[PDB]
């Protein structure tokens, strides 16, 4: 009696947690710029999450060792009575690595804890990363840096989603933040609770690549185009309904 | 007037093209073994999307010029009557190449011909591709190559599919073909009419992550998992409903 209509199980005492670290500031010895809007895409985040019913926990600027530890941390605690696992970072990245304050993070790795050999708890849950990073190029202007963090699947039940592909170029306004973050958040606000997940991820994708970048105020970021991907390896489908308590 | 249940429009006179790349043996010097399988795999797909209205071009076994040539032709030609592009390559390949029978292709230069820039007939519309590829290792028994061929996207309204994701394994049958092909086909046949295309591959990402591969013939070849991916940057839901062709031209 296999089954199209297959939904991942929702249905769990709580929802999960969903983790975001959010990079603004790094080591001057890297060269990388500020990232100034990235609060507001935090923000947006938490709140549109938590009213997904996720136990939303943000790190402010963590470097290497402090991040590894809070993921770890988080890979090794019982989800057993979670419907999912969310992780999120907004930073800076290059091929397969995410800045930290201090260094340069394997993305792999860190997808590597939430892998069912190492974390049964989330065997079978879907396990969602969404990642706004990009090279840093160097009152609410839009800054635009180019694609630089390879859009890699993860494992089983993994859904790996990037604010830019190949090619692209990622656009974030000072004050409102990343143009991924604001559509997604959007689209969370608006749908989240009743439209399958990768469904409006494809709304974002629309929203994103829809954004006009002909008359701009900068010469030079014209003719700059965003379009964000999501690499699934999902095997059910996935609705954030509403929970019953 | 922003609409969340939006379809791309496929009431084109024609569905579109499905290219099929086919290679089964390879030049000496490259020391590529023979995919022996693929064939139940080009004629299992050729079969699924003609029933889905594409027409269907195969090619067994073409150099890369050869095979250049044939993409390119097909890039140029005009698509505005079509609803979508496909295509498929049954082949090995390492990172951002496939092979052809003589040498390796750039996948990003194959996919660079249907953006929309070059490909004017085609923007707006989904671009397909199908990559059964990977690393070839040296009646009917299970063959079984490593992850090689990395799973990038391309650009807009492209959905790239792949038989295989990095650090998992890629099973071929030598009569009844590819895992992911035969799951994918079986799906296509079921539900390839109804349901929209994304929700079908994720169909196609359980029937084959849940094979089974702990009693095995060969010993070796015992917990080598399969777990294919998708790409979407896709921007609108796909559908391959009946087209209605009740006295009308569709060639
Ligand atoms: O998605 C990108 C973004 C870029 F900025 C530059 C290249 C790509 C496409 N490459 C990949 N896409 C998926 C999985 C792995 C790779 C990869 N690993 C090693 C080299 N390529």
């Known amino acids: 009696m296999f089954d199209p209509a297959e939904k991942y199980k929702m249905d769990h005492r709580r929802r999960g947690i969903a983790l975001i670290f959010n990079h603004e500031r790094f080591f001057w010895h890297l060269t990388l710029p500020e990232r100034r809007g990235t609060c507001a895409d935090r923000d947006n985040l938490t709140r549109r999450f938590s009213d997904l019913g996720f136990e939303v926990k943000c790190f402010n600027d963590l470097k290497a060792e402090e991040l590894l530890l809070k993921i770890h941390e988080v890979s090794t605690v019982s989800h057993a009575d979670a419907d999912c696992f969310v992780c999120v970072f907004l930073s800076h990245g290059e091929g ?8 340069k993070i394997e993305i792999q790795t860190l997808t590597g ?3 069912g050999d190492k974390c049964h708890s989330l065997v079978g849950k879907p396990k969602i990363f969404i990642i706004q990073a990009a090279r840093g190029n160097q009152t609410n202007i839009t800054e ?10 993860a494992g089983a039940d993994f859904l790996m989603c990037y604010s830019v592909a190949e090619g692209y170029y990622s656009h974030r306004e000072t004050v409102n933040g990343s143009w991924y973050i604001q559509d997604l958040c959007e689209m969370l606000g608006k749908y989240g609770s009743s439209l399958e997940f990768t469904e409006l991820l494809t709304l974002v994708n629309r929203k994103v690549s829809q954004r006009r970048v002909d008359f701009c105020k900068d010469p030079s970021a014209i003719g700059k185009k965003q379009v964000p991907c999501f690499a699934s390896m999902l095997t059910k489908k996935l609705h954030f309904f509403p929970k019953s308590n």
């Open 96 to 103: 397969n690595h995410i800045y930290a304050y201090d260094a």
């Open 113 to 115: 804890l939430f892998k």
């Open 144 to 153: 635009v840096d180019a694609a630089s963090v390879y859009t890699l699947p």
